[PDB]
């Protein structure tokens, strides 16, 4: 049977400059629209009606302060479809109401699905194991937990991260002040996975480059390599002895080493995603109850834990009125927490 | 401080006083460690994806490598053939030496910039300040996300070391 | 009537060290939150 | 300090049960030929 399905399959999988595949039908429109929506919004669209913020090059923002901001809190978790009951097909109103935010987040989610299907698809055609796709599950877990699950647990999309550099920084500081997220052991594991991943990256790269075999005469050692050579280009034995004597332990199995490099950052991102799922419900690691009971009763007891809560209290009170305009917080000067003089 | 919550205290007060999130060297540092972890899982996944079959399904594939063996344990051509098609051919390495150099250089250079951000904010050359940068026709301040960051920073500033300041400016 | 599907199981010494280090570090991390 | 007193047995079983599992598997690997 060589019907139309098999002929389409032929054309989709042609060896061209940009491989397409069946996955490309999902991947390419969704990725392109998510990116086009972000450039369109950051260049032309305001956040005046949803946040009280300017947020585009058109309004005078720069690369650090432009964003596609989340919709107004009054939108709830509305899909905000262009043809839905809020914008009612009006493209201009849709932009002013935050429709570009759900547009980017939803086309982005489906684009990420498409990229992982592409990793599977290409891997199956070339005949390699699909561990690159398996590793990409960690970015997907992060995107889904931070941009979808977290606001879905909260009151509305408004509290999701906005798509911009400074808007994401506000998101980091909100998470310190309100959730005490640095204290969360699931974030801690994520940090260990990210910094340990950076470390493994640097040390393995540096180790290969400094246990190279002399396979050429030039002072530039890059040329002395051939992609089809059967020999290892560097000495695992010398590398193993160096680290055993510098650090005490060393890799001896090159296959374990490279699996470990997959494992560490991927597991770290997965752990951080679990903690954010908890923050969706405000299920924080905010306090140590034992510390609070002692400190309530003993005004001489002070730790770095109690010092940081005072900072969190400052963040909440000073940023909430501007950051949550729909709440209409009026905090007179006399109620604002402040230290002496400042 | 030499402790876990003391680290967080240092980071929070640093943001209040130098706006480190808005300094390009901390931003390069983040690119360094986010990129380092990306390339770490990247290299890990490609090499693991192209391990030459040397074992049965009931044993660990790790036994297919023997310490000190002369021959490579994976097929870099197959790895290049997969990753070149994932992006495009010329976005993929086929020289292992320059691949491993890029793995070395990217996080190391990024962390150099991160350390230089801390070292130069030690002398109070702080992150970008766009507080009240956008002004309307009458002169009303139009807030941006930078101004929301400033509100959070003010809260950290006014509470930190709450008994330690007698005069209005926290100059060091 | 011996079942043909049985297979010996292995844990090498480096895996034991790795496993014990993971468990002890996880305990050292989570213990503070267990005591609260 | 008023800590949760279940924290003790929770930590102890957290270390012991998986550590013991690993030791059983390792020792019976050594004893194979």
């Amino acid at each position: 049977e060589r019907g139309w399905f098999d002929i389409l399959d032929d054309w989709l999988k042609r060896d061209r400059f940009v491989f397409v595949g069946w996955s490309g039908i999902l991947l390419f429109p969704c990725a392109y629209l998510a990116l086009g929506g972000w450039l369109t919004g950051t260049t032309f669209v305001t956040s005046w009606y949803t946040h009280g913020l300017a947020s585009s090059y058109l309004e005078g923002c720069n690369f650090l302060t432009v964003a596609v901001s989340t919709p107004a809190n009054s939108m709830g978790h509305s899909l905000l479809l262009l043809w839905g009951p809020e914008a009612q097909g009006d493209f201009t109103r849709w932009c002013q109401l935050g429709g570009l935010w759900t547009f980017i987040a939803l086309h982005g989610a489906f684009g990420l699905i498409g990229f992982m299907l592409r990793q599977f698809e290409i891997a199956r055609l070339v005949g390699v194991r699909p561990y690159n796709a398996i590793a990409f599950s960690a970015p997907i877990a992060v995107f889904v937990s931070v941009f979808l699950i977290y606001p879905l647990g909260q009151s509305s999309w408004f509290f999701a991260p906005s798509f911009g550099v400074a808007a994401i920084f506000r998101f980091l500081l909100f998470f310190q002040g309100f959730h005490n997220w640095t204290l969360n052991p699931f974030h801690m594991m994520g940090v260990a996975g990210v910094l340990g991943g950076a470390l493994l990256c640097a040390i393995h790269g540096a180790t290969v480059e400094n246990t190279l075999f002399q396979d050429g005469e030039g002072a530039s050692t890059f040329r002395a390599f051939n992609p089809t050579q059967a020999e290892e280009t560097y000495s695992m034995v010398t590398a193993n002895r160096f680290w055993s004597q510098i650090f005490g332990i060393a890799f001896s199995n090159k296959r374990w080493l490279h699996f470990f490099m997959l494992f560490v950052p991927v597991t770290g991102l997965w752990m951080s995603a679990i903690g954010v799922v908890g923050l969706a419900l405000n299920l924080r690691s905010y306090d140590f109850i034992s510390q609070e009971i002692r400190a309530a009763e003993d005004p001489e007891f002070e730790t770095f834990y109690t010092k940081n809560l005072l900072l969190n209290e400052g963040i909440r009170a000073w940023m909430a009125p501007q950051d949550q305009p729909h709440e209409n917080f009026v905090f007179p000067e006399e109620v604002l927490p402040r230290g002496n003089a400042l | 401080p030499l402790g876990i919550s003391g680290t967080f205290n240092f980071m929070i007060v640093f943001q209040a006083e130098h706006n480190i999130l808005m300094h390009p060297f901390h931003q390069l540092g983040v690119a360094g460690v986010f990129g380092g972890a990306l390339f770490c899982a990247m290299h890990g996944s490609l090499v693991t994806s192209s391990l030459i079959r040397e074992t049965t399904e009931t044993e660990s594939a790790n036994y297919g490598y023997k310490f000190g063996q002369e021959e490579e344990t994976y097929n870099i051509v197959a790895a290049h053939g997969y990753f070149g098609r994932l992006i495009f051919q010329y976005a993929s390495f086929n020289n292992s030496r320059s691949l491993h150099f890029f793995l070395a250089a990217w996080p190391v250079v990024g962390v150099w910039f991160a350390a230089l951000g801390i070292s130069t904010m030690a002398f109070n050359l702080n992150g970008f300040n766009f507080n009240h940068s956008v002004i309307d026709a009458k002169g009303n301040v139009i807030n941006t996300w930078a101004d929301i960051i400033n509100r959070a920073n003010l809260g950290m500033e006014v509470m930190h070391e709450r008994n330690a300041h007698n005069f209005p400016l926290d100059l060091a | 009537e011996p079942n043909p599907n049985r297979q010996p199981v292995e844990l090498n010494r480096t895996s034991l060290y790795l496993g014990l280090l993971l468990i002890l570090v996880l305990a050292l991390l989570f213990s503070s939150y267990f005591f609260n | 300090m008023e800590v949760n007193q279940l924290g003790l047995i929770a930590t102890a079983l957290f270390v012991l049960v998986p550590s013991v599992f690993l030791i059983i598997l390792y020792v019976q690997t050594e004893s194979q030929q």
């Binding site: 193993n240 | - | 002890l24 | 300090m1 003790l8 270390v15």
Partner: peptide, 30 residues
């Protein structure tokens, strides 16, 4: 109780370092 627990776990890790360095499986070339 909680202080003893923290130090005990820590002390086990330092002991584990010792065995992992000095009583490792030797790497053997082939």
């Amino acid at each position: 109780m909680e202080t003893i627990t923290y130090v005990f776990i820590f002390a086990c890790i330092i002991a584990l370092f010792f065995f992992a360095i000095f009583f490792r499986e030797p790497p053997r070339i082939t």
